[PDB]
């Protein structure tokens, strides 16, 4: 009875929406005490393309991607192509796994086409440059997050903290 | 389950020989290592539980009368396990998330693999962000110049914590949980000072894959050498093999044996789990099951942490 | 049980004080103080044993087999000493 | 209590950083290569540590006599120049 | 049957070539009588006569990279792209030319008295070692050639890029494979690694530990080539070129001794190896064994796929043959050395010390059957599927060589992934648990008492502590009166425990002259050795770290002899050298005849306690300087070295290009574009250069597949054709060819390497060898090893800045004295009008650690090397490449003294030298700071210069005004000074230099004008 | 480029009438040279399918599938069912390699739902049932490679090393 979306932070500013609702489920299985982004995802093998902000899954394990969880539906233009899978909350990989178990884990997770028409030529790269920061934490990680603006105030390190726990995968096409 | 050894101060765990004044014309020296062997652990915890007319010249017969299978030991800054990773000569803390593509790097091609290992062991190592040896020079003072003696100057490497570290051991046992937890151990060398915490940690074990990391030293039979140094290219991807001695047993004042084994940090390959089997007698697996039992031989998965011993 | 009281104490500095390490920092200082993880001076936990344990060798000349007891020994016959100091951290310098 | 920033330099500058000379007698010169340069830390400076003991009955004494009667002892180098004396007061008040 | 013709393969085109092609009056080629090779033909007169289709159809075209250059038709045709001049460029820099100038057979007389010379040389052999006048000509063709001063010609006027020798020895080296493969069929490649030579050197209480350590890394691998040497002849070795190495000549006039020469021809060559494979002395001949060892642990091989035992070359029999055949070699000269060290020792029962050799060596034997140190061998085969097309070579034939030589290297990296310490081949648990140990001494009260040399394994022999010695060592084991005393207490210090393998060490460092044993191989019979080694004694006296330390004191008492040693001769100091001692120290030969007992132990007199009141009072009345206890360990390597033989470009900008920028070279694009068309432009002045420029602007843009070479191809056609006695026409693919194999290395990025390139480099490695020794020399240094790039040496702290300029200067060929007969230019090495290149573009790193003389040499010596291999890869500095700031990784001068660091840069160029300019500002800082040093000895400068810059650099930084800095620098050093005006001007290109550092626990100031200070702070700790 | 297909090796043949080119190309994916097979492919986070086989893409970056990458065309019953992509040869995960790359070829994949009707858990196998290793050899092994047992005389080496090297993870659904 639980429905997470599974979302990634590019440079660029493609899943501006991605749920019909503001908050979605009823519980969190993400953590914030001041401390680290706790219960962090990443995934193996999915690579992304920045607009249209779609993980392309690329098959080497040397590309990956670092994204939350939130719960939702996408845009109800979607729920029919991209990936609807259930896990038994033991085979997620997550970071500094200090969260919650849910023990329901279905997730929906942007999911397109290999499309053999060029090669994937992958580029990661590091998030710095706050104004970076800032255009997604003001569209996602304070859209989903109404714990925000409440203990921010100490309202930089849970911003560092940002930098050194996520990296993606760009296609840079 | 769980145990975290706090150290309050520098820590020594020296690893060679004579540290003391032995040629009239030389100081000495030491050098600490970054994870304690589990030998050390394993006395440590001993020293808490003891009895005073048990074993007297066995000095792990009667440790294990006493310990669980004691689980490796990786560092744990602020829910951050830092995890050991050894290259030749090369050792570097390496968080969670760079040990999964792992298997996978070594088995590139030349310039790629030799890329990413220098980034892992160079940039992407955390190392030197939460300790840095610290030199520690002292003296002998003779009374009668109240000067330094004939060269009695020693030069210890200290183990300086740059920020709040604890050693991650996992304990089976639970009846232990309270009489550990709380207590002030004498850890390490050179008379320092450690901090006991535990709490029940659920930690998943029965898990088989591909490739290990060697979370603690892997013990070798001492008779499987020749049929294991001839092709160590076909049980460990990278690291480190090397003689030890497993330390200095207290009730019978004896440096305990010598073995040779494989360093933390080491990424062994699956093929070596059954070879050891395959290549050990019926009582020298009663010794390396109670050499196991102290913390040994401990593995790990390299996409989850998913511990494993090996005889057992 | 092995460590079963603790007393802790203040390092009230009356005169200036000096505990070197050699040229032990990269600073424009040719004899440094004891420096900390964090640059802080501090007194090792070696330094302030041998210091006080000198001390009380001569403030106490009788008491050498308490002193060495708690203190450790000297020459080659040995056995566990029973206290231990931990390192003089700074705690509060004058301004 | 300063903030880590400030107070790594409101303290570096607290700590006494001399520089000592060594004098040619006969002229009453500095001797080439006589000078360096030291670091004391100030007077009413504060340290902090403990004295952790196990329990043998010598630590009965110690900890009882030896202890009650130490205040003033000797740190450190350079005690002619007078850099060593100091006080231990015990947390007992 | 009998093969291996490649004794005409170093003939096949003589060092007479480049004169008889554009001759200025044309005399031999009309005095002889399908051009050229007539004068080798007439030099064919040793031995077999000339098989001309075997080495030029093949072997010479794949040698070199001449054949693909300027290509297969102008290449032998040698007519159509012609010029009148003769220059010589550098290998690595194709910009600096040479003036060859004409001293060279002219006459067809003189040609005859060089044959003369060669024959009284090798005509007193016989028949039955074909194999050895072969391998003496190896040797000797190039040192009777430059002996007779004659200046060493290029491949081809066309493209002077290797010398005329470097391309014959690797058309001789090919001719393994090619022979191999004209045979039934196989091609190999041979790499052969020490495993962990840096933790093994970095074992022994001693330097006379230090010493053996290196010298059995380099015997050791030394005894498993002399089977190669012997077997297929010298040049089968591609990596050290042994044509200047000093164990092979060695080996080669012992070996000669061996079997019965006249003893009036080997001193006819073992002058020419006394002058220039030494540099002239023979104290090799008054040591009998080379002084240094000089063999990198780190070798390669090309081998031919055939072998002996059917009494010639028959077919091998597997692809397991050499990588066993190696192991069984190097674990049998370990066992046949150990097995003469017991077999001397049992012929010297006496003298207390041997007595203890043999009683322990009796006792572990089975624990020294495992050698201390063991090897990691890789091998690479190929077959005539492809170099062949059934015919004659293939096209991408040339880009062979270099596929198979990329694929060796990157094994030994997967390899290297795994360290395993040699001490994990024994087996120490029933020893260590059962007391099963041999322990000749006190059996420890705490187990089994580890080593202090190695510190890992168990002690063998526990020499007691120094309470009563004589007393203590008689009721013992180790002793059985007072006299062994007074000779075992002589090499063991009391206190010293020792491990079986730390007491071979300290055995075969009693008298080094077992390591015959190894160095001649096969050769004599060990008891042969040892019956010479036993018959004379002379005695080999290595210094210690305190008799470095203690240089510059007794120089002070050679000059005081007789008035310092007036209130002696009671003391065992102003004694008369009564023995025939000699070192491989040179200072020490160049003194001991001065006056004073250079055998004195320091630490015995004034670095003692019980004395030195006595030494102090002495040297204070006599106006001696009582001495310093700080010696300087010198540490050296250059850097990208495997870079280089892969031929990247990496060493020639050492920070941009760093080591993922071959992952992916299209990030990288622009420099290697700029970089390789700068270097190919610039190799040949001829007529090619512009034919090539205009192939290269084909290739520039991505010009298509012939699609442009219509543009270059006239330039070609144009000039085909001015030439008649072409015999076919074939320049319709040659220019696709050409722009091919340019287009090859460009999209590569990297010169693709061959044989000729890995000999010039592999020589020009031993030139400097031979310079850098003489140079350590110079400075009162002991060179503990030195091969080549690699160097490790004590020095006093006192001329350790002058030896790194100097080394650093020379490293790159550049320098201001003579060094022997190696008389260094601008670049080149003149050996008496002889041009050999060197390596200019390559940098150089230094460790210099001052220690005292009584510090760990373990710990000591893994510092050195761990700031050597750690910081030169972590920190970075502001270089221009370019008219343009970038950072750099290399060329940099880390002292460490007991926590104070200092980094020095010695590059400020990325491509350290492209022209002549530069060789001037090289390691120029270094003469900064030795200005520096002698103001403030001069007293000019106060030592406060060194703790007062801080309070100006905070505002020397943040300024970018030149002009302003310098008023700045010039009030920090007017504040500073005791006369009345010093002049420093630092340079003011040191400004804003910055370093940095990518986060390790060395720390640095990030500027190169505090560096200075630091550096200047340490070496003055280095006198305390 | 010339195409390829990776094909998982299942205890099951339900997918080895799906790829017919037995000549190919310009080069080829394993390489029978006495020392085993070469070049076996390995794909992270992708479970396997055990019946209808496929690829059940798990997010677990810990699964992983022995199988082997097959010549050309995929029969045209595809471009529904499968999806394609086309690599530098640099984004795979090979296996003890021998053969030379082309640095570029088409690899198509196939694909199963995300399987949102039953726990997606997972167990390893083994290559053992001795008879179903010369089963699997004779029934797509050859299909693909019929070289195998015609010209080679050894059968420990290159025909009995599988049954440790190949272990990839059944969903058990
Ligand atoms: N004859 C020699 N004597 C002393 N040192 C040597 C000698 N030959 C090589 N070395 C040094 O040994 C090292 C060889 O390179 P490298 O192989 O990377 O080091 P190593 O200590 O051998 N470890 P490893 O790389 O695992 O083999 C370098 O530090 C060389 O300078
Ligand atoms: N291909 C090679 N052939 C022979 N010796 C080599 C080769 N590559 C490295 N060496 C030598 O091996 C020893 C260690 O090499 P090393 O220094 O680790 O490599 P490098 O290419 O020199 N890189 P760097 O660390 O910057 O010095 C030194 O003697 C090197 O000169
Ligand atoms: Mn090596
Ligand atoms: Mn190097
Ligand atoms: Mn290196
Ligand atoms: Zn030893």
Known sequence: ?173 | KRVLIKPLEPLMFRSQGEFEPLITGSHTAAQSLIIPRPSTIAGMLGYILFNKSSGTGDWLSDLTNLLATIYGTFIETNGEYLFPLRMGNHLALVDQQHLINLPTLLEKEYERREKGIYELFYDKNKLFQIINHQDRIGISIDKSTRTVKEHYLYSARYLAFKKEVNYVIFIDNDAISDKINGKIVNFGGENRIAKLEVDDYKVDTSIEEEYYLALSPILIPDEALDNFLDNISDYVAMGKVDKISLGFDIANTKRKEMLTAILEGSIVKRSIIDFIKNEIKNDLRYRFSKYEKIGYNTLMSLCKLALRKILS | ?95 | ?93 | ?1024
Not at chain 4, 67 to 80: A, C, D, H, W
Request: aromatic share 10%.
């Open chain 5, 1 to 1024: 049957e009998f093969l291996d013709y490649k004794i005409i393969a170093l003939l096949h085109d003589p060092p007479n070539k480049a004169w008889v092609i554009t001759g200025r009056a044309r005399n031999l080629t009309q005095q002889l009588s399908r051009k050229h090779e007539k004068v080798a033909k007439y030099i064919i007169n040793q031995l077999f006569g000339k098989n001309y289709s075997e080495k030029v159809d093949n072997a010479d075209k794949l040698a070199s990279s001449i054949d693909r250059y300027l290509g297969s038709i102008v290449y032998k045709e040698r007519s159509l792209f012609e010029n009148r001049s003769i220059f010589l460029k550098n290998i690595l820099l194709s910009n600096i030319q040479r003036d060859i100038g004409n001293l060279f057979p002219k006459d067809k007389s003189k040609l005859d008295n060089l044959i003369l010379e060669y024959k009284k040389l090798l005509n007193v052999i016989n028949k039955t070692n074909l194999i050895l006048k072969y391998q003496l000509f190896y040797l000797i063709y190039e040192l009777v050639w430059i002996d007779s001063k004659y200046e060493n010609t290029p491949s081809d006027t066309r493209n002077p890029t290797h010398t005329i020798f470097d391309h014959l020895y690797a058309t001789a080296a090919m001719m393994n494979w090619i022979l191999s493969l004209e045979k039934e069929a196989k091609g190999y490649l041979l790499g052969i690694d020490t495993i962990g030579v840096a933790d093994f050197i970095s074992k022994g209480r001693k330097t006379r530990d230090l010493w053996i350590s290196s010298y059995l890394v380099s015997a050791l691998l030394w005894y498993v080539i002399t089977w190669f040497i012997e077997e297929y002849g010298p040049d089968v070795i591609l990596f050290p070129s042994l044509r200047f190495n000093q164990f092979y000549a060695f080996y080669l006039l012992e070996k000669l001794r061996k079997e019965g020469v006249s003893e009036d021809v080997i001193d006819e060559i073992k002058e020419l190896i006394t002058k220039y494979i030494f540099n002239g002395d023979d104290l090799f001949e008054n040591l009998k064994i080379p002084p240094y060892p000089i063999i990198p642990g780190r070798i390669t091989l090309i081998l031919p796929g055939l072998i002996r035992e059917g009494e010639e070359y028959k077919k091998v029999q597997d692809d397991n043959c050499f990588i066993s055949k190696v192991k069984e070699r190097y674990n049998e000269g370990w066992r046949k050395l150990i097995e003469g060290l017991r077999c001397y020792s049992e012929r010297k029962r006496e003298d207390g010390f041997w007595n203890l050799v043999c009683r322990v060596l009796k006792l572990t034997e089975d624990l020294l059957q495992t050698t201390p140190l063991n090897i990691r061998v890789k091998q690479v085969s190929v077959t005539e599927d492809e170099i062949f097309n059934n015919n004659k070579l293939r096209s991408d034939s040339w880009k062979i060589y270099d596929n198979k030589y990329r694929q060796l290297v990157s094994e030994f990296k997967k390899s290297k992934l795994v360290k395993v310490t040699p001490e994990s081949r024994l087996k120490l648990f029933e020893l260590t648990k059962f007391d099963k140990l041999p322990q000749i001494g006190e059996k420890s009260k705490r187990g089994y008492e580890f080593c202090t040399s190695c510190g890992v394994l168990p002690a063998v022999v526990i020499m007691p502590k120094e309470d009563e010695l004589e007393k203590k060592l008689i009721d013992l084991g180790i002793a059985r009166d007072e006299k062994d005393v007074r000779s075992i207490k002589n090499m063991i210090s009391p206190g010293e425990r020792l491990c079986p393998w730390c007491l071979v060490k300290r055995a075969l460092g009693a008298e080094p002259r077992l390591m015959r044993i190894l160095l001649l191989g096969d050769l004599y019979s060990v008891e042969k050795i040892v019956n010479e080694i036993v018959s004379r004694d002379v005695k080999i006296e290595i210094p210690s770290t305190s008799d470095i330390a203690s240089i510059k004191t007794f120089e002070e008492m050679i000059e005081k002899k007789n008035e310092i040693c007036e209130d002696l001769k009671e003391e065992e100091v102003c004694e008369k050298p009564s023995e025939s001692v000699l070192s491989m120290w040179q200072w020490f030969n160049k003194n001991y005849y001065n006056g004073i007992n250079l055998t004195i132990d320091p630490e015995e007199y004034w670095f003692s306690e019980k004395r030195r009141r006595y030494y102090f009072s002495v040297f204070r009345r006599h106006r001696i300087t009582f001495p310093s206890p700080y010696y300087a360990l010198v540490r050296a390597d250059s850097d990208y070295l495997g870079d280089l033989l892969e031929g990247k470009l990496t060493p020639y900008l050492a920070g941009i290009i760093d080591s993922g920028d071959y992952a992916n070279i299209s990030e990288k694009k622009e420099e290697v574009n700029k970089l390789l068309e700068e270097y190919l432009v610039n190799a040949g002045s001829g007529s090619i250069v512009d034919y090539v420029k205009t192939v290269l602007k084909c290739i520039r843009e991505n010009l298509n597949k012939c699609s442009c070479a219509e543009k270059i191809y006239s330039n070609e056609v144009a000039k085909v054709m001015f030439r008649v006695n072409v015999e076919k026409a074939n320049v319709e693919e040659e220019v696709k060819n050409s722009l091919e194999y340019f287009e090859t290395i460009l999209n590569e990025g990297r010169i693709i390497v061959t044989p000729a390139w890995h000999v010039s480099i592999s020589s020009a490695l031993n030139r400097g060898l031979l310079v850098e020794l003489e140079l350590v020399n110079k400075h009162k240094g002991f060179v503990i090893y030195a091969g080549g790039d690699d160097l490790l040496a004590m020095l006093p702290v006192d001329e350790v800045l002058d030896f790194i300029k100097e080394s650093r200067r020379a490293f790159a060929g550049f320098g201001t004295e003579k060094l022997g007969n190696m008389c260094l230019e601008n670049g080149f090495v003149r050996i008496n009008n002889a041009y050999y290149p060197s390596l200019p573009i390559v940098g150089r790193s230094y460790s210099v650690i001052i220690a005292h003389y009584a510090d760990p040499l373990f710990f000591v010596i893994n510092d050195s090397y761990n700031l050597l291999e750690e910081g030169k890869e972590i920190i970075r500095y502001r270089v221009m490449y370019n008219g343009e700031y970038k950072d750099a990784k290399k060329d940099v001068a880390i002292f460490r003294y007991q926590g104070l660091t200092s980094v020095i840069p010695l590059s400020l160029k990325r491509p350290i030298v492209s022209s002549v300019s530069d060789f001037n500002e090289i390691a120029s800082i270094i003469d900064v700071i030795l200005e520096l040093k002698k103001r403030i000895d001069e007293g000019r400068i106060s030592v406060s210069l060194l703790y007062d810059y801080e309070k100006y650099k905070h505002l020397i930084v943040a300024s970018d005004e030149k002009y302003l800095t310098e008023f700045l620098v010039k009030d920090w050093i007017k504040r500073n000074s005791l006369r009345k005006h010093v002049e420093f001007t630092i340079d003011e290109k040191l400004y804003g230099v910055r370093l940095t550092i990518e986060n390790y626990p060395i720390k640095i100031p990030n500027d190169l004008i505090s560096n200075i200070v630091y550096t200047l702070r340490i070496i003055y700790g280095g006198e305390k």
């Open chain 3, 1 to 95: 049980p092995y460590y079963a009281f603790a007393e802790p104490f203040f390092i009230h500095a009356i005169t200036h004080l000096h505990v070197g390490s050699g040229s032990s920092v990269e600073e424009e200082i040719a004899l440094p103080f004891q420096r900390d993880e964090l640059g802080y001076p501090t007194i090792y936990a070696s330094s302030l044993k041998g210091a006080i344990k000198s001390f009380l060798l001569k403030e106490f000349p009788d008491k050498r087999d308490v002193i060495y007891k708690v203190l450790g020994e000297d020459e080659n016959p040995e056995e566990a000493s029973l206290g231990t100091f931990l390192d003089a951290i700074l705690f509060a310098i004058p301004s």
């Open chain 1, 1 to 173: 009875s639980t429905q997470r979306e599974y979302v990634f932070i590019p440079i660029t500013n493609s899943i501006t929406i991605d749920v019909k609702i503001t908050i979605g489920g009823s519980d969190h299985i993400t953590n914030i005490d001041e401390r680290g982004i706790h219960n962090v995802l990443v995934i193996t093998g999915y690579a992304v393309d920045e607009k249209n902000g779609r993980l392309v899954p690329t098959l080497d394990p040397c590309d990956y991607v670092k994204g939350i969880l939130v719960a939702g539906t996408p845009q109800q233009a979607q729920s029919n192509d991209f990936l609807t899978l259930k896990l038994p909350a033991n085979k997620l990989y997550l970071i500094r796994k200090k969260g919650n178990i849910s023990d329901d884990l279905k997730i929906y997770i942007p999911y397109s086409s290999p499309d053999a028409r060029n090669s994937m030529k992958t580029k990661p790269v590091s998030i710095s440059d706050d104004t970076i920061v800032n255009n997604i934490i003001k569209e996602v990680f304070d859209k989903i997050y109404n714990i925000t603006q409440k203990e921010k105030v100490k309202i930089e390190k849970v911003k560092e903290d940002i930098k050194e726990l996520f990296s993606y995968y760009a296609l840079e096409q």
């Open chain 4, 1 to 93: 209590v300063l903030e880590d920033s400030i107070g790594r330099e409101v303290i570096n500058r607290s700590l006494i950083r001399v520089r000592r000379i060594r004098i040619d007698r006969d002229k009453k010169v500095v001797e080439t290569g006589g000078l360096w340069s030291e670091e004391y830390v100030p007077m009413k400076t504060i340290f902090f540590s403990v004295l952790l003991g196990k329990e043998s009955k010598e630590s009965a004494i110690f900890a009882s006599c030896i202890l009650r009667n130490l205040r003033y002892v000797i740190l450190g180098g350079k005690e002619t120049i007078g850099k060593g004396i100091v006080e231990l007061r015990w947390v007992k008040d």
